[PDB]
Amino acid sequence: TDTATTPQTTDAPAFPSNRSCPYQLPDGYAQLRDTPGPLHRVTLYDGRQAWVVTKHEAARKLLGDPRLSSNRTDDNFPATSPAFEAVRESPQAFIGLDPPEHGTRRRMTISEFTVKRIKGMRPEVEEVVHGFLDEMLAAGPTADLVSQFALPVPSMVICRLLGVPYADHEFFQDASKRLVQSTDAQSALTARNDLAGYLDGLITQFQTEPGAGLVGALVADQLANGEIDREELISTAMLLLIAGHETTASMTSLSVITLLDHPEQYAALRADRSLVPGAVEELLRYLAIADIAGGRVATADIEVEGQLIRAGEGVIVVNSIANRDGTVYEDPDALDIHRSARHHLAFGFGVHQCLGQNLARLELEVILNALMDRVPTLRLAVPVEQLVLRPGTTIQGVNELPVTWHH
Numbered sequence: 001t002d003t004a005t006t007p008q009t010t011d012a013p014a015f016p017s018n019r020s021c022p023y024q025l026p027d028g029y030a031q032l033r034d035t036p037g038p039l040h041r042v043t044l045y046d047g048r049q050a051w052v053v054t055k056h057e058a059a060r061k062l063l064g065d066p067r068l069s070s071n072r073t074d075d076n077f078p079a080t081s082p083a084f085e086a087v088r089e090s091p092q093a094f095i096g097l098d099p100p101e102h103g104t105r106r107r108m109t110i111s112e113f114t115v116k117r118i119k120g121m122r123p124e125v126e127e128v129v130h131g132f133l134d135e136m137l138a139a140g141p142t143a144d145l146v147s148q149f150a151l152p153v154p155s156m157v158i159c160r161l162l163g164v165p166y167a168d169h170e171f172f173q174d175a176s177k178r179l180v181q182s183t184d185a186q187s188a189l190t191a192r193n194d195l196a197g198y199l200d201g202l203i204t205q206f207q208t209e210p211g212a213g214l215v216g217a218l219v220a221d222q223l224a225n226g227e228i229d230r231e232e233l234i235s236t237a238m239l240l241l242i243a244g245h246e247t248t249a250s251m252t253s254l255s256v257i258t259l260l261d262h263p264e265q266y267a268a269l270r271a272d273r274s275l276v277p278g279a280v281e282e283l284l285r286y287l288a289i290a291d292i293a294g295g296r297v298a299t300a301d302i303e304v305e306g307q308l309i310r311a312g313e314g315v316i317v318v319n320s321i322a323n324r325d326g327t328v329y330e331d332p333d334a335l336d337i338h339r340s341a342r343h344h345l346a347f348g349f350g351v352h353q354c355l356g357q358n359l360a361r362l363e364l365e366v367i368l369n370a371l372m373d374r375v376p377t378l379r380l381a382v383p384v385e386q387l388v389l390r391p392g393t394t395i396q397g398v399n400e401l402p403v404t405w406h407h
């Protein structure tokens with residue numbers, strides 16, 4: 001009987017937005033990047049307004065502010081998709097805890113991610129990388145890099161760290177994908193319960209016959225001392241399993257696409273492997289694949305450079321936009337593997353800064369060196385315009401990456 005007849009411009013754009021190019025900001029995010037001030041209003045999928053943080057130093061300050069809680073079960077935590085309500089209703093790992101509780105659980109896992117342990121993992125990582133490469137190269141002239149290399153490699157590595165038997169990998173890889181990428185709460189809740197039932201059986205097995213890896217250590221020590229609830233152990237292992245899978249696999253696939261679209265830099269990298277760690281840092285900054293890991297809720301009023309975040313408002317620290325802050329990175333939208341990408345926010349900042357960041361850095365270095373060593377002729381088997389990018393409501397990446405090479 002009547003429709004919207006007036007101009008449709010808004011000062012609270014829909015958020016998140018979808019990438020159209022794997023290594024560029026969505027058009028809407030480039031606009032948010034360009035507007036002065038640390039904060040901007042956005043509209044989430046259900047109509048609720050929230051703040052996004054769009055500048056680098058303010059992103060650090062707010063991630064460091066204990067008044068921005070990580071409690072996903074809070075009624076006002078910003079949900080960016082209906083699938084989030086599964087997370088709001090479900091038990092929480094320490095990614096959803098605040099101090100002091102956050103520290104007591106995170107410290108149960110840190111021993112597996114120390115610089116010294118990551119170093120001792122290089123033989124396993126190199127062996128896993130080159131083994132899946134052996135298989136993919138022998139299996140055809142073309143391949144899907146995602147299912148045949150990008151995903152299995154970090155899956156096997158994190159399963160060894162955790163004590164999760166890789167014999168069950170078809171089951172929990174599928175459940176991990178369904179949980180991270182589901183668009184509705186039912187699909188997400190079902191995938192979470194699938195993983196939870198699997199991990200619960202693993203825990204009882206380790207109570208009968210003590211097991212290897214971090215789940216084995218948690219069952220034998222903290223669980224037996226009542227220091228972690230059985231439900232929390234499940235959530236903790238599940239967080240580590242999924243983060244260990246999906247993040248590195250996405251960085252691998254998107255780095256390959258990005259590097260093949262910048263052949264001069266890829267060639268420089270091939271010619272001087274000492275550049276590989278710096279290139280990994282730049283690709284992390286540039287691809288910034290985890291904006292869904294920026295959500296917070298204010299438990300008190302917070303003044304930010306003349307703007308006010310009110311208690312109970314949702315805040316999303318958008319690290320991809322913050323990593324394109326031209327006051328920190330000159331010419332921020334240019335890929336430069338020679339630049340200083342230090343201080344980037346791809347792993348967050350503060351007490352929740354990525355537990356796995358140095359494992360991810362080790363994996364990505366080994367992977368890039370291996371692809372340059374073993375498949376220097378690697379190229380995409382389809383044009384970039386035929387690839388399909390995941391939406392902005394999940395970890396960025398591609399679900400399929402057809403590639404080919406020289407026989």
Ligand code: HEM
Pocket residue numbers: 070094095096106158239240241243244245247248249251288289290293294295319345346347348349351352353354355356357359360
């Ligand atoms: C591959 C690139 C990766 C990226 C870009 C990434 C990104 C992030 C970000 C931005 C956060 C901060 C979340 C927040 O502030 O709420 C985070 C936390 C976390 N990440 Fe990573 N991650 C990566 C790899 C990994 C890996 C391999 C693991 C292995 C277990 C992992 C485990 C975790 C955990 C457990 C947390 C929660 C830390 C805490 O709450 O104290 N991540 N990650």
